[PDB]
Subunit: 372 residues, 4 copies
């Protein structure tokens, strides 16, 4: 078995999935859905990697020739994972290994690093994905609930995935490279619990803004992301579910400034209009940010897998943004709602809901981008 | 066989479906989906009715105990249609006979009048539908393309229906009374061919604004509708498809004022903003009209079965209206797009597309109105 | 104005007659469910002139244009001119299929449907040539009894029967095949559901329409022997056995024709009397012999299971014993999917979804069996 | 501190052992695909200590928590401590099922999987009592070969086989039933797909695990006769015949054990040699006798058709001949739905959707046959 470091595979012979920064060796795998794809001959292939964690252990999934093969947790330390063995030596196999767990904002210990491969065969040219999609979202885009029984409720890694996920289903159907940028419970303006700090726009611009602390800083997570190096055809923004929820949740005491925050509902039962306007402003500002870093991308706000109540607030944001900016490449697309037969665990979208949403999103993108 | 005129069946023993005016005997059936439901014992039931037409003949459909049984054309004259025969005399049968064809704005001859029933059994109490839904739309709500082969293109009655139609599927699922108000090719502001006269708001307030001419005037179609007599829980507005289309269609020379009308697109390929604003205004004005006549209804703009490109212009209208009016009972719900496997005739939604849209709309209404 | 063309004056190239026909050409008697005509015509307008008669059991028909369901209606006794299409674009051809929704009625000597001619402003064009041909033999499932109507409906009347929503015509359509339907609700391979030994399909198989009886039907030519040589199917689908199974759990039957009572017995533990099972086995062997005699080259396929699969072993016993003796390598068994609680129509019979499921599995089978990809 | 509890030290009411077991209790050998253990435990954390060995064909396991698929992975030789869950809410019980994905391997004396015990901070609670019991006997279909992997994949290796995506475990799960899987890819009721006459399921049925050979397996207790009285199924599902039919189209086999060549012959007209069919018929009769001997009360259901139905008449001939000769009223035939082009997995075998479809039909059948509504 030859050993080849990940950074010593020429670009035509590896697809790196997910946002990368300056660190090439070993390769930090920052986001859910991030990882590597290679095409190799030979009988045997191993990946050498390193992980660390405490409460939230790492999970990875494996696909060979586009088909789901394996999924498992990895506990802290050095690992040598066998990706395949005893295979016919002359046949090339396409191998994709990716992270199942989202980046963890409040967990500075959790990491996954790819070092290299042990192999008896040769690396071949990988498929080239000219089509690129970025997905920005909350627990739905982290695939929380995509595994696990209906009544399971523990907030732990085994229930989250990129392997059963509307975003990766969509990218696969369209033969597209994809980036996932997501955080469970977070909104465009505030988290479901009224936590104003927990908004996606605040972490969007760094390599991985959701990877904090000195270790992640050494990994290059807190540097500004090189947007010019990876420009998506479309940016799918699945946010708002948590912003809606906050209106019905208790006030949040912010330990960083001592102030309390609450999205208010009137004695009328209706949402406080000033508070809706905070979401609208957050949407205008985030769309501005997205456009600044992605000059040519079609921005598509795609929302509805867990209710559609923020439809009008979202489109108010898009409309006000596009008028002021003269931006003709921002759209709204409603995703299908998760029904009783289609829930996974955590009262979240199950695999069938993810599938339903992907079918509709793929149809929309085929027509919008002319990807027939 | 006893004869009972339609107006001589007590209200607890008949459900009249669709908008009615001053004329009660015989009963004019102005709209698609309009007609009657009774429940009768006996071996045999006939309905006596009158129809007239020229180019566009009448079509009706029959359902017994909720199940589709028959569909046929009716040519001009008096008819006696046998609804059932040779049945067990003691068992009650629920019988629903309704019009498959939309009102025809440009056809003053077409009509359908229900006179009475011939029956050996007795009329029983009918189901009571406290739930009420109004649907306002274009050819989709007229069910154009719901029947016929994929490649059929002739613009004739046989391809239209209430029998295979998302609106009636939705009402049936929710145990609701329904009214359909629809016209193929028409928009909220203009027809697909830029015909500014062809807008639904212009015909909304009359008993049947789309039934014009001397004969229809005698039927009471051009009198103002008594909205207080039938107040819906929700109003589903499926308009905009034809408004978007007009942007890519040649100018329209209006014979009523000699002026030409054209929804313009820039050399940019983008829609003329001033013309978009005309649609926004028409939407604001129409929502005002809807609220005036329906003070308590949840108004739900439901659009997307044939593309969703007007999503933002529609929601701009809804948002500006609701801000100025202080109206908290207006919503937007995007319907699923018709995909290649789901077209009917005329490149319009087939039965499967209607089914998919109904599934999503029913789910939406259950949550919105608390109809679990 | 519209031209009038008598049905018998349309050249064989410009009309497809669906279903078994006999000596009578003008007017054309339509004997069986799924029977009728297909033409392809230009013009704006098309009518069919026909005659029907009936008493308790009124005629039903259904109309398909360019392969799509359009209409379905009752027809009461007398002369009719039915408008099939109107106000259409004159230059474009339309394929028009009008067929009978109601089975032949064994006990009813009055019910009939006769096609006389077409009124048309356009021209008849050449019709599809169906080299593929399928015969379906069965009971109420093949009569599509329950394919229309609500779950709780029980009245044994015509409106609930169809060829328009029917696994057999679904199968024929998917495969681009001409089809013949020969069916009778409640009948078995050996006896009816009610133990009536007279109500068996093989007994009526050989005549033009053995199920059309009495003097009126005799003059229409129904009781003459059918000319099997004129229409040879690639496969014969035999959906029988459901009623034979049921008879074991039904009261004895007094036969008014011989005064004998007949009863398929169950043993005290609840299983079928073996000797009575053997009677069904014999009936199957004999029917397979009859089928092979009139159809020397057809693939015979016993297709059963839409309302339970309990007779599986008895059916295959009949097929195996028949085949071993005859050296017939063109007889097969294929199990159809059972109707589940979500897929019943009226009369607790297969609804449209069950018919669809069965047709899907049957179409797959036939493609592989016959080389019809 | 996590408690360690040896598997043999858990009271029988607090553990469900899935799959055939023999004399060896500590550690527990898991012989068959679908075999493993189920416990219900509180606590934040659970590990299983196990040992595996293998050469060419490495072990695969799958994990389900509260009836839901969670994980699947290979296991290379040695002792392992596999964490089944962690960081969970301490007071809530979790049902945990860990089972073997890989079939018994007839020609591989090294491959094994032994369960040693659990590490746990919580307590074992009483497990579900499965009164319902189903045995499945079959070939690669019952081994779930092709249930994972891409369409064009052909390598005959463990990663493509499963009990996690398998019509048998799907059926058992839907019916709240304990299950035993006894299967071997390529094997028939009479001979292997390659005419190998030694490769037949009946020859390995009677031992604890006849497919676990060699000294290592002999020590694990695999070659002792199975204690059938200790686990009596309500029904035995026999999915065999696919490889028997295939052999007719395959080259002759030189048997290295006796020096003779074996060939199921096909006639020049293209049909199967009858004498050779009769060998399958006899094999079926003998096997049903074997099944009845060790399972005097079980409903035996031959369930066949996921990869073609060409042997159905030969199978039912075997069943009918057995049934009449023995007076056995509790043997049935049920045809499973064929895998279509959209539903293939790897190896041109049934993919997950086909397994699902087959389970749907089989579950309906079993609900009706056994009264499990
Ligand atoms: Cl259609």
């Amino acid at each position: 078995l030859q050993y080849t470091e990940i950074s010593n595979i020429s670009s035509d012979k590896i697809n790196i999935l997910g946002r990368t920064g300056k660190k090439r060796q070993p390769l930090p795998v920052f986001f859910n859905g991030g990882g590597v794809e290679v095409v190799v001959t030979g009988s045997e292939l191993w990946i050498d990697l390193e992980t660390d964690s405490d409460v939230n252990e790492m999970w990875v999934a494996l696909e060979i020739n586009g088909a789901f093969i394996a999924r498992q947790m990895l506990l802290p330390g050095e690992h040598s994972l066998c990706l395949f063995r005893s295979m016919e030596k002359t046949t090339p196999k396409r191998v994709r290994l990716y992270r199942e767990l989202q980046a963890m904002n409040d967990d500075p210990k959790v990491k996954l690093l790819f070092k290299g491969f042990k192999h008896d065969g040769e690396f071949q040219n990988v498929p080239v994905y000219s089509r690129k999609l970025e997905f920005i979202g909350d627990s739905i885009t982290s695939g929380e609930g995509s595994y696990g029984a209906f009544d399971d409720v523990d907030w732990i890694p085994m229930y989250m995935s990129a392997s059963a996920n509307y975003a990766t289903m969509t990218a696969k159907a369209l033969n597209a490279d994809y980036h996932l940028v997501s955080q469970g419970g977070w909104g465009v303006f505030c988290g479901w619990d009224n936590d104003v700090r927990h908004n996606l726009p605040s972490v969007y611009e760094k390599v991985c803004g959701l990877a904090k602390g000195e270790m992640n800083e050494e990994l290059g997570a807190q540097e500004e992301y090189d947007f010019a190096s990876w420009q998506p055809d479309a940016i799918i923004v699945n946010l708002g579910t948590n912003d809606v929820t906050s209106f019905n949740q208790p006030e949040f005491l912010n330990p960083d400034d001592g102030k309390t925050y609450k999205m208010r509902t009137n004695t009328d039962g209706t949402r406080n209009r000033e508070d809706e306007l905070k979401i609208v402003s957050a949407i205008i500002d985030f769309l501005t940010m997205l456009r600044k870093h992605n000059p040519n991308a079609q921005i598509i706000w795609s929302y509805g897998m867990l209710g559609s109540d923020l439809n009008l607030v979202i489109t108010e944001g898009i409309n006000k943004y596009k008028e002021n900016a003269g931006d003709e490449k921002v759209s709204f697309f409603q995703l299908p709602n998760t029904t009783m037969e289609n829930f996974g665990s955590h009262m979240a979208p199950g695999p069938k809901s993810h599938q339903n949403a992907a079918k509709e999103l793929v149809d929309y993108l085929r027509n919008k981008l002319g990807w027939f």
